[PDB]
Design a protein around this ligand. Structure first.
Ligand SMILES: *Cc1c(COP(=O)(O)O)cnc(C)c1O
Ligand SMILES: *Cc1c(COP(=O)(O)O)cnc(C)c1O
Ligand SMILES: *Cc1c(COP(=O)(O)O)cnc(C)c1O
Ligand SMILES: [Cl-]
Ligand SMILES: [Cl-]
Ligand SMILES: [Cl-]
Ligand SMILES: [Cl-]
Lengths: 524, 55, 511, 515
């Protein structure tokens, strides 16, 4: 397939290169531009499996008949704290159990929630024996996860009670649901313009283009000379009232830098002074990998729909865990109040089965209903075991006051960067906005640092992206994404610093150094 | 629980937080067989062992 | 001399006889890992012995199926620290270095049993790959392709220097009368060796300047431009001053080699590097001109293990110098190494170190014992796997705590800068007296005492012998302590003794 | 193959057996030591950092470790070790335990450098017993621990040169045949010594004839260099030979230096070293490699008697030579004329100035002391008998189809065995055939046939001067089916030589019946 990559003829060369890839991880980058982590948070997963064993015993205590097979009943909330405290006490030597005991203290003692309700939500939830209720998100899991979201998005000033979440099957489901609900509710109409922060991976460029949404894309271009920050002139394009929504991945993918303070402030001022109606849709999956991250959701909560995925930070791509966050008073609901009477009446009919007064149905709840064709709203929602795992990842981050996990992953990314660039003039100079979950390996910069500016200009002209990607693939079996495009004046390639082990980054550096040495030998 | 151990066998660095790597397919039958042999008294484990035979 | 007499102890004797402070701390996790690995290996060996007997006899461990058996041992012992470390080690080698896991485990098991001669003799295959990653990292030599670094495992830096001077002489790279520039001050043994009649080298001092916090001035380093100086011999971080060469200094040498002395040999002893902040070796700066000697002794608390390596870049000035010898010298060398290989002119200097270490003919049974190479690899893994440098911070904080305890009654520790290492610390009478009672008093006090009075007195009240101050000359009463070999109350006792002496000096002076 | 290459490159067979009890005792001692270190570390920390073990109270703590681990083989051995050192050698038990604990942690430089104090006393008891040197008071023997016999020979030749005991052109008598490395070292240009062969006689079963030993009476021969038991022949010098050397030293050459390598002594029956016969004239080199299957550990010792011919020769150097040595060794002590040769070996091994940090690593010395204790405490020699029976089992397997093993006498060692075609064919088909087969065949065809069918390369039989097709194998480095394959290949070859001899004979008869 290779959609992201493609986005003796030159075409067939590209096809041959794609065929070299041999791992699911390499193919995921070529097809969809995502780096699947090869690390994962184990403590909250062990806590999840240990909670399940406790829950299985709680279920068997509720089965009343002598049975030859394993059948259980529903766990009881009465007496649950004491039974859970016995389980904790009998298993102090099991890491997952110790984590569960601390998480109960955090929720009961720091969040101030009902301990038996928490334990029962977690036990019944991990048994997966009841439909999610309410469908938008389990009650205590929502309060736990939103504390995590607010902290990592740098949105401390927003009172936590003003934030609501819809738990979904990763950012992948969130985007599918959000675009469908914006169309269904007349918030995005045929011909409307969608401003997109670019560069961005292909799936997000593609969604608005679907014929089912007659949308026009307007590029808000990141500037390489500014280390991929969006210049004020680009951000100012958001002033055109024709742009109904600003769609952004922050930290970005592929550049992998977070928006700096100047950029965030610019957007905040454009919104307060010129576009109080602007809808913002931001995907902040990489936030925790940045230093002192602050989301567009923290800056303009009333105008932003935040999409947060747990996939990359917790190494949970296969768990499909995400949330859509909205402030209680937002521009989407303001926009719904402004629809023409004809659209409002059609929506009264569409959601009539949900509640008496549809005009009072908030957009975040329309997302839930639309995700399952409305009529099935009562059985909608993310599975309860998924919500439980999501809550345990959240508690793991929240209870780690010194951010040990976050520091561990950031040092791992830097260690890999050093290994990759060792033989290429060392890692590129970083700054406070660098995230580097993805890295751009530029031929001009590498050859310059190694043999000087003059050799480098002769080198890029002598070479090509295709040449570079082929030499690396042929020697290591790893196919990098084209950094700029096969026709570029500056041959470059991109790799994720999350999906390979050190000797593979070393091999890539060695293949590239070798190519640089042979070019210089010729230039000698 | 077996998979968490498999993931931790793939983590290369010293750390005080629990971090694991991707589980390896090489030698997996042997490690699974050891897990099964050591936990013959746990109901879930006997079931996993028979599942392998069925498949 | 008189000091050892009034204060007898192995620690004191070592300080005066060898100018070294033996660490009183040691890395234990990789040691427990070594002993646990040994228990696994003993069981592997016993199961390879085919006959029944009550006697403890074992056979050779088998490589086939070794990973599965090792994984069972790890899974069965999650509660033994040494075993968990071994489990992480397997992943680091398999997953981060990308080396064959069965080969790594068999090299470690076979190696700890010590049942086979080291092969190749220069260094076991996988231990070399593991240890060079550790060397490259701590020497701050990241820009050097690691496949270009080769190592010869030796019985500590002590064996390294002996091997190196003998091989440089035997191969005509350092002839009697050649000038050797030495970074001074340096401890006595390095002053003495080049001057043995056996080598008869002429020493040229590159003097560290106390007024620059013991860095070498550009004027001193420029002496290297003199072509008669064939080699620059340096301990960095230095012993006794204990500071690392600053950026200005390393760049000065790099320019000299690049612009004036492409042929200069460099021999650097960087055993204290890990105790410095952001250390960078001359090997990282001039890899093709430098023979690096690295000892595991001080950092790991492993003086008794005798673990060291000699590192060389695959393309280096020593082999260029071998290529530039006169043909008649080459012919003599062909006859010397004839038994080793058909084409002696292709024999690299690092492989000559190995052969010369055991009189050439015994080359195939030369090299560091295999259990020593296994322990060296485990110390190296322990540092590589410690991404946050926790062990390093712990030792640095321990050094600082001792320094604070030592100087508490002496005006506090001397102002530290980015190049400070302080494995050895200078206690200067004038400086201490100045901080306590004023420069006026310190100029007087200094004429009232002397290095000998100071040392004899401290040794008599505390049982501790300091190294006499070296580097200024003699003009200044002063002594050096190691912050690595004593416990807190002993540093407190030294400070107490010096303060009392300062207080008596002041009592007089005041009246 | 590495084992095959070792035989070809170094002329030695690496054992495939090893002493495990003393190794388990070493790893268990280490775990005890690690906990001792951790208890001397005073600060809370996340990483494993330890302090130095304390001697105060060490016996009680060690006794608790022993009592709590009665089920671990290594631990029982350790407990008996303490009794042996304390109750039989009469040494300080706390000092012994602290030397072993601090030693195995490898946290202090070896002191004194020549050898740890207690390890030296323990190892010399073992050396004296296995070398058959009991008549020598053990206090009269000093040892220098080194990195195997390999390091010993390098240090010894270098020290003999540096101190002027052997000068260019001096003659060195060498017991032959001997393996290659020892013929090559004396001829290096850096030594330039003249070699004089002392040839073992195959008709004397590889013993040195008196006429050969008598070559030592030549005053120009400064040293006799011998490997005993020998390699490659693998026989120990008999009583007659030892006595001949003893009489020559006593009557004609009181000044003769003897350098003997006795690594194979424990494989011989009732071994006696030249060191036991002429202690004052001999430097003994003993390696632990072969007997304990410890080639990778590199454990060796150089042994010298307190009063020896080496120090006498240093006292007889020209005053000009002593003045130069006064300068070489000045940093070590004030009276260089009192520095004994065994201590110059130590200083010279590390360029003199690094003397105080010279010496074998302490964990190596601890392992060597445990191998020594294991042998000393094995009163009935069970380990030795076990190894000898394994060697004999392999020998039986090798020769089963070759007419059974050759007749062994009281001087046989057979760590290496000589497969002599003349003997094998005589045993299979008679002397007449045997006399004919020795003329038809060659060592080269023997080695090629075996290598061709089995993958195993043997060493050519050396020492004969009358074309005797033969090859040598080590009985220490292969498994039974490999020795069986070697025997099968040889039997096949003997059968083809026989069919041909038989055919020629029948033809000779038919040809005559036609005339
Ligand atoms: C990796 C990635 C995600 C995660 O999507 P999920 O469906 O939640 O796994 C989201 N957005 C971007 C830009 C990504 O690169
Ligand atoms: C302590 C130290 C060493 C270590 O020598 P080893 O033989 O390796 O124990 C080396 N050089 C210097 C300058 C040191 O002070
Ligand atoms: C096997 C062997 C040795 C052992 O040498 P090390 O260096 O001690 O391993 C010594 N001498 C001879 C003749 C040998 O055959
Ligand atoms: Cl657990
Ligand atoms: Cl179960
Ligand atoms: Cl342990
Ligand atoms: Cl044991």
């Amino acid at each position: 397939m290779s959609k992201d990559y493609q986005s003796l003829s030159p075409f067939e060369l590209k096809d041959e290169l794609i065929k070299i890839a041999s791992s699911d991880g390499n193919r995921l980058m070529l097809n969809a531009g995502r780096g699947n982590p090869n690390f994962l948070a184990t403590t909250p997963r062990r806590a999840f499996f240990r909670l399940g064993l406790f829950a299985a015993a709680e279920s068997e205590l509720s089965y009343s008949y002598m049975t030859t097979v394993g059948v259980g009943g529903l766990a009881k909330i009465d007496g649950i704290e004491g039974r859970f405290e016995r389980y904790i006490a009998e298993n102090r030597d099991q890491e997952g159990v110790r984590f569960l005991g601390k998480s109960l203290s955090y929720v009961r003692d720091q969040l101030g929630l009902d301990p038996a309700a928490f334990l029962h939500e977690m036990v019944d939830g991990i048994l997966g024996c009841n439909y999610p209720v309410p469908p938008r998100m389990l009650n205590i899991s929502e309060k736990i996860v939103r504390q995590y979201i607010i902290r990592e998005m740098g949105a401390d000033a927003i009172p936590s009670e003003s934030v609501n979440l819809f738990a979904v099957e990763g950012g992948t489901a969130a985007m599918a649901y959000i675009f469908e609900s914006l169309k269904l509710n007349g918030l995005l109409k045929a011909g409307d313009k969608v401003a997109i922060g670019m560069p961005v991976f292909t799936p997000y460029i593609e969604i608005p283009e679907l014929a089912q949404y007659a949308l026009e894309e307007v590029a808000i271009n990141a500037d390489p000379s500014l280390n991929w920050q969006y210049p004020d002139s680009e951000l100012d394009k958001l002033k055109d009232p024709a742009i109904k929504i600003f769609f952004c991945v922050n930290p970005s993918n592929p550049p992998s830098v977070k928006m700096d303070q100047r950029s965030l402030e610019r957007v905040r001022n454009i919104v307060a002074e010129h576009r109080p109606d602007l809808m913002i849709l931001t995907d902040d999956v990489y936030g925790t990998f940045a230093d002192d991250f602050q989301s567009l959701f923290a800056i303009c909560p009333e105008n932003t729909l935040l999409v947060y995925s747990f996939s990359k930070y917790f190494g949970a791509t296969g768990w499909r865990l995400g949330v859509v966050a909205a402030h209680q008073q937002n521009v989407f609901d303001l926009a719904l109040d402004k629809l023409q009477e004809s659209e409002k009446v059609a929506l009264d009919h569409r959601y009539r089965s949900l509640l008496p007064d549809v005009r009072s149905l908030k957009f975040i709840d329309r997302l839930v209903a639309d995700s399952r064709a409305v009529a099935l709203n009562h059985t909608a929602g993310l599975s309860t075991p998924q919500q439980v795992q999501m809550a345990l990842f959240s508690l793991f981050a929240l209870m780690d006051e010194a951010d040990e996990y976050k520091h561990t992953l950031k040092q791992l990314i830097r260690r890999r960067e050093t290994t990759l660039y060792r033989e290429l003039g060392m890692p590129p100079l970083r700054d406070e906005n660098a995230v580097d979950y993805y890295t751009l390996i530029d031929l001009q910069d590498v050859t310059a640092k190694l043999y000087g500016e003059a050799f480098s200009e002769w080198a890029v002209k002598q070479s090509s992206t295709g040449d570079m990607l082929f030499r690396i693939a042929d020697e290591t079996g790893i196919v990098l994404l084209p950094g700029r495009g096969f026709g570029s004046n500056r041959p470059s390639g991109r790799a994720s610093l999350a999906n390979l082990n050190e000797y593979e980054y070393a091999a890539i550096g060695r293949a590239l150094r070798k190519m640089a040495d042979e070019l210089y030998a010729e230039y000698s």
